[PDB]
Amino acid sequence: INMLPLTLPNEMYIASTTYEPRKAIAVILNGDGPKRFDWVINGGTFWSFHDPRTSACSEIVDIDQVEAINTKELALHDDIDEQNRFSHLLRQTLRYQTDSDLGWDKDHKALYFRSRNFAYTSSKKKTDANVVVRHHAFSPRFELMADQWYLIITPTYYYTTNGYAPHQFAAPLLAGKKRLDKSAALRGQVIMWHRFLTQAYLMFGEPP
Amino acid sequence: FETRIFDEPELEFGDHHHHQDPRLGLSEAGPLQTFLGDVIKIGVVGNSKTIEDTRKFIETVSSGVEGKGEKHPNMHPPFPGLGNQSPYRCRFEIEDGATAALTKSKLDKIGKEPDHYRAVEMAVDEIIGELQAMDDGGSRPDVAIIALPVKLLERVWNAPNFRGMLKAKAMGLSFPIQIVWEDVIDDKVTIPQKVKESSSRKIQDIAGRTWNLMTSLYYKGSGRIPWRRMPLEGEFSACYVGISFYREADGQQLFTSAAQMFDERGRGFVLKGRRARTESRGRHPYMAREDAKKIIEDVLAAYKLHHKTLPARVFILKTSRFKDEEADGIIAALDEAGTELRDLVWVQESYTARILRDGNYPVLRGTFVDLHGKGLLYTSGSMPYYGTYPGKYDPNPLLLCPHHTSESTVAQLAEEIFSLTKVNWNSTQMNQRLPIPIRAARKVGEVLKYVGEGEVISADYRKYI
DNA sequence: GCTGTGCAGT
RNA sequence: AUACUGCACAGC
Ligand SMILES: [Mg+2]
């Protein structure tokens, strides 16, 4: 019910190089072109849903060893190390897609907003509160069940003094705000995150 | 995603009064293997104040305890003692020469505080010396209560584990110890905590406390299960087995394996298992064949020793995903034993997806939604019989993957472990969340850490519980 | 993802 | 160590 039906693209650009994922991000931050955050950490290959010909530099790999394949044969793969790599690539793609009005945690791994009421159009009652300090965040998790990939949604709060300074001892207050659920406080948050995600290389469906 | 609800299985005591409550079904029924009147002898260790309090508690609970029950008064009955209205059909007794006492000089020598190892092992030895004096005497106790005083409790609490070495030394004895803190025998001084320093530990109401402690004494003294788990529609003698991996306390990362069986009606057997190699985190101390084959062979050897037959179903359930070599070993051993029905499930205390939030009441205890391949088992919840949810916030499901699949589907597995949840012996509380072969893992590890070298390891869950 | 420790309410 | 449920932190 909280789970989210991702829809995969039809093409996957792959390459083979011998680089390392630190100096590669170093050159991609000191580059002079469009920066992208969905190119995957080099576990031996280079997988993305983007053409490297129109990228900033693409000096990680040489041009003649780039291939394009279909994502159906790669999404249905066993030997779950590749499944972990696919979840890695999907996490970087989601972090790059909704990257403008969002921030990614390093410890608790959530996507916090960065006061905005954020009213959204719905047929039910307008239950909108402060989202940008009591934030609203969620931890995305990728799981492939039966024939379909899926995102697991988990709401949480990220606390900050002024939006930039980190929290200090707001964890018991976060736990106390978590301990509040009467079948309205979680379904509304799931509805809000679905409405935000429905509005791009990954298409998000309707949760059950 | 198809949905269904489940009802809790009934409990049988004397083929009368099919009830779900383990307390009401003891109070007004005929408990299993009852008699006209039985005596259970208790033995107490500690200073004279603890012995006086223990005797006062034992001879005052027979008069009767109140049964107000502010939250669902069918959660517990008023305890009427073990007289005419005996819930266990017995009469407890304490022998005068059985109870022991240690002098103030030995306690002060323990409280000299050299470090937090030497005083601990000195108190351990002295306790087993008093227990050996108990055992070699004429007044042998069926169950021994270790009501250690507050000063020795603080000396132990200043930090190894006292409980592990105590149970390891008591495993070679003839009676199981029933360690109970001095706060639990109606003493006004509350025991200080560890981290919070100036704080008082909390405890339940007196009636439920007496119910739990007296049922635990009933099991640990009288060797007899109170409640059995009668099988579902079309079952046989199964071999529900859990596997746990523990790390010793001497700084060694050897994640050694164990094995626990809960085959017949709830009777448990704990077996040591094999050695431990090739664990970066710990997934395969069942490497290839050389461990798994003879671990399963020892499990079947214990089953042949007791039941003088072979199991019909084996339901190996754990919490860590297995590999191909371990699965090959399990399948080869079960084929060599001619096993009919098998399952190899790993159960997740994880999988953060929390669903079925609709309804005015919280979600009921027992509700299966079957994702296309894996199930979402809700084992803790609410009932209209209990009225509401007096627990905490939202419960936690489990998800079950039948890795290295077999001849069973997920509905049978979910119904089986929802039958398996409430056969708990440490508690008469109804709303339980974990299967007993999983919950027993920490309890057997905290004792089997300190056995050490090669001795008679034995097989009885009564020492660990 | 899974092993270790520590509380709070009934 | 009468308990069960739930919550937080650390390690790999
Ligand atoms: Mg116990």
Residue numbers in the entry:
A (entry chain B): 166 to 279, 286 to 303, 318 to 384, 399 to 407
B (entry chain A): 3 to 161, 180 to 485
Task: Kindly provide excerpts from the paper associated with this entry.
In this study, we investigated the SPARDA system from Novosphingopyxis baekryungensis (NbaSPARDA) and discovered an unexpected filament configuration upon target DNA binding, which strongly correlated with collateral nuclease activity. Based on these structures, NbaAgo is divided into a MID domain (amino acid (aa) 12–50) and a PIWI domain (aa 250–485), while DREN-APAZ is divided into a DREN domain (aa 1–146), a bridging loop (aa 146–161), and an APAZ domain (aa 161–442). Collectively, these experimental results led to a detailed working model of NbaSPARDA that highlights the importance of the transition in assembly form during the activation process. gRNA loading, tDNA engagement, and guide–target heteroduplex propagation lead to the “monomer-dimer-monomer-filament” transition of SPARDA complex.
The structure of the inactive complex, determined at 3.34 Å, showed that it is monomeric with the DREN domain being flexible. The results showed that the collateral nuclease activity against ssDNA, measured by a fluorophore quencher (FQ) assay, is correlated with tDNA length, with 19- and 21-nt showing full activity, 17- and 15-nt showing weaker activity, and 13- and 11-nt showing no activity.
